From Swiss-Prot, chain A:
Disulfide bonds: none annotated. The modification N6-acetyllysine is found at residues 36, 104. One of its GO terms (biological process) is cytoplasmic translation. Ribosomal protein L8 appears to be an aggregate of ribosomal proteins L7/L12 and L10. It comes from the Bacteria. Keywords: Acetylation, Repressor, Ribonucleoprotein, Ribosomal protein, RNA-binding, rRNA-binding, Translation regulation. GO terms for cellular component: cytoplasm; cytosol; cytosolic large ribosomal subunit; large ribosomal subunit. This is Large ribosomal subunit protein uL10. Belongs to the universal ribosomal protein uL10 family. The keyword Cell wall biogenesis/degradation does not apply. Part of the ribosomal stalk of the 50S ribosomal subunit. The N-terminus interacts with L11 and the large rRNA to form the base of the stalk. The C-terminus forms an elongated spine to which 2 L12 dimers bind in a sequential fashion forming a pentameric L10(L12)(L12)2 complex. Two L12 dimers associate with a copy of L10 to form a very strong complex (called L8). The lineage of its organism: Bacteria, Pseudomonadati, Pseudomonadota, Gammaproteobacteria, Enterobacterales.
Swiss-Prot record, chain B:
The keyword Electron transport does not apply. One of its GO terms (molecular function) is large ribosomal subunit rRNA binding. Part of the ribosomal stalk of the 50S ribosomal subunit. Interacts with L10 and the large rRNA to form the base of the stalk. L10 forms an elongated spine to which 2 L12 dimers bind in a sequential fashion forming a pentameric L10(L12)2(L12)2 complex. It comes from Escherichia coli (strain K12). Forms part of the ribosomal stalk which helps the ribosome interact with GTP-bound translation factors. GO terms for cellular component: cytoplasm; cytosol; cytosolic large ribosomal subunit. This is Large ribosomal subunit protein uL11. Belongs to the universal ribosomal protein uL11 family. GO terms for biological process: cytoplasmic translation; ribosomal large subunit assembly; stringent response; translation; translational termination. The keyword Ribonucleoprotein applies. Keywords: Methylation, Ribonucleoprotein, Ribosomal protein, RNA-binding, rRNA-binding. It holds the Pfam family Ribosomal_L11.
From Swiss-Prot, chain C:
It comes from Escherichia coli (strain K12). The gene is rpmJ. This is Large ribosomal subunit protein bL36A. It holds the Pfam family Ribosomal_L36. The lineage of its organism: Bacteria, Pseudomonadati, Pseudomonadota, Gammaproteobacteria, Enterobacterales. It comes from the Bacteria. One of its GO terms (biological process) is cytoplasmic translation. One of the last ribosomal proteins to be assembled in the 50S subunit, it contacts a number of helices in the 23S rRNA, acting as molecular glue. The simultaneous presence of uL16 and bL36 probably triggers ObgE's GTPase activity and eventual dissociation from the mature 50S ribosomal subunit. The keyword rRNA-binding applies.
RNA sequence: AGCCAGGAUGUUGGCUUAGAAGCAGCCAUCAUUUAAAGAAAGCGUAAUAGCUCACUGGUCGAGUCGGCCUGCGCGGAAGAU
């Protein structure tokens, strides 16, 4: 109904799934067609990774009071974040792969253990293994 | 790069294939019998869509897809033609297990892996074709 | 062009412009739609 | 009776009549059958049949649709269009009165590198304007 | 408002048609992943192809859109010493 009341709903939904998330992986999405994003979206459903593009202002508001606050430095530019409903630290590997293979977007940041990890030092998430 | 819908066992006719990829430099005969070679397994008289993929050196590859839903929906329904106009007359009733059979047939084409969602997409398409579900 | 008393937009590309106290209709799509209030 | 064109596909049934014993000749019934025929023709729905000829034009592919557009301007219906490697072949059935001088028109649309063929196919009823056209000229 | 991109998938919805493939027409118009997606509001093709739009994310960083009433103006407005 109300676009402010839709924001009251989108903020409450993206933060409620941030309650159960384990590792947040944020990245860029501009310059890529639709069906190419669904190559990852099917890859997120099978790995239990929730992927949802929300606005930068909305994101900060939502993640306030949550361990993913330090990510306010990376919420500029087009934003494609990934949550880890199950299998913690798995989104990252998939993300990095797709990025360097065929697109122009990069991995803005990751968010494990409620701290911010810069783009080049995220091989740490890749090194961590599924258990 | 070109997309066609070719009969399961026959690539012989000139007008459907000749002009579209002749400019691309596709060797007609090659694609004809490669296409037929792999589409041998398809049921007789199933029109199947193929995406032909040509490169600067005129060489090509292709992917075969699942037949168009409307062609595949009227065969299960056993209705040779199509509904003249919906919301007035329905030519038959499509079965539910057939919708999921159709859903797993075009599993690759559908973007949703929910399978039940695939059925809804197929059912929605059928609804536009004037059929009703039991 | 159409020099007439009633000038108006005839399509979605027609634009009303005033240039010397003269209302004109200029169209970037159809040159038939060129009008002038006179 | 309408214009002078020959009547076609007509069935006649002589259910009743009258005959005088001493004044009935072959020509008297000929005049009598002709009066009745003319009277019936006007009461009935009398229409012209134009001839339609099968047309197969062969054209370069760059100016295909213009040929089709001119065919639709010559009041013709279409039954297909094959596209060979040498050039497109369009099939049609155009009335003969609208097939007059097609070669110079077909050459103008195609840089003069098209060709065509006409074969007579069937007869078909003309629309009201062309039927009204052939009646005024023939009548006067 | 401008600019950077997407503008999906079943698919060329079903009929009609030589072709009707978002875009001749009739009958619809609803599922899909969605940030968002008209079985397209336009251009275009013989049909395709192709170009935009609606709809969205970013950038930007402060007002902006559509009507109603009303004051004063503008065009309409060419004649003979
Ligand atoms: Mg059709
Ligand atoms: Mg259509
Ligand atoms: Mg069109
Ligand atoms: Mg005012
Ligand atoms: Mg005035
Ligand atoms: Mg005035
Ligand atoms: Zn205009």
């Amino acid at each position: 109904a109300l676009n402010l009341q839709d924001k009251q709903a989108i903020v409450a939904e993206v933060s409620e799934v941030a309650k159960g998330a384990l590792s947040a992986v944020v990245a860029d999405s501009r310059g890529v067609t639709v069906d190419k994003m669904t190559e990852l979206r099917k890859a997120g459903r099978e790995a239990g990774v929730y992927m949802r593009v929300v606005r930068n202002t909305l994101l900060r508001r939502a993640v306030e009071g949550t361990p993913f606050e330090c990510l306010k430095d990376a919420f500029v530019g087009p934003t494609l974040i990934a949550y880890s409903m199950e299998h913690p630290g798995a989104a990252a590997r998939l993300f990095k792969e797709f990025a360097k293979a065929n697109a122009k977007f990069e991995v803005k940041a990751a968010a494990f253990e409620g701290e911010l990890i810069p783009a080049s030092q995220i091989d740490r998430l890749a090194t961590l293994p599924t258990y | 790069y070109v997309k066609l819908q070719v009969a399961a066992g026959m690539a012989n006719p000139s007008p459907p294939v000749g002009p579209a990829l002749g400019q691309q430099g596709v060797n007609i005969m090659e694609f004809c019998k490669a296409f037929n070679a792999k589409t041998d397994s398809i049921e007789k008289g199933l029109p199947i869509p193929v995406v032909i993929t040509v490169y600067a050196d005129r060489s090509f590859t292709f992917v075969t897809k699942t037949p168009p839903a409307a062609v595949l929906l009227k065969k299960a329904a056993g209705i040779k033609s199509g509904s003249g106009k919906p919301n007035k007359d329905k030519v038959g009733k499509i079965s539910r297990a057939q919708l999921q059979e159709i859903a797993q047939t075009k599993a690759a084409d559908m973007t949703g892996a929910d399978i039940e969602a695939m059925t809804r997409s197929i059912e929605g398409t059928a609804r536009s074709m004037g059929l009703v579900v039991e | 062009m159409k020099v007439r008393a009633s000038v108006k937009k005839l399509c979605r590309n027609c634009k009303i412009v005033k240039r010397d106290g003269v209302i004109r209709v200029i169209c970037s799509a159809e040159p038939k739609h060129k009008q002038r209030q006179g | 009776p309408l214009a002078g064109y020959p009547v076609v596909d007509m069935g006649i049934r002589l259910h009743f009549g009258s005959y005088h014993d001493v004044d009935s000749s072959e020509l008297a019934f000929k005049l009598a059958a002709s009066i009745a025929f003319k009277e019936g023709f006007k009461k009935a729905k009398p229409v012209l049949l134009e001839p339609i000829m099968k047309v197969e034009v062969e054209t370069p592919e760059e100016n295909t649709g213009d040929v089709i557009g001119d065919l639709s301007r010559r009041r013709g219906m279409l039954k297909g269009q094959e596209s060979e490697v040498t050039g497109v072949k369009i099939h049609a059935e155009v009335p003969l009165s609208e097939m007059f001088g097609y070669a110079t028109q077909l050459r103008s649309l195609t840089k003069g590198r098209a060709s065509y063929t006409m074969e007579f196919l069937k007869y078909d009823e003309a629309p009201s304007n062309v039927a009204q056209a052939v009646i005024e000229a023939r009548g006067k």
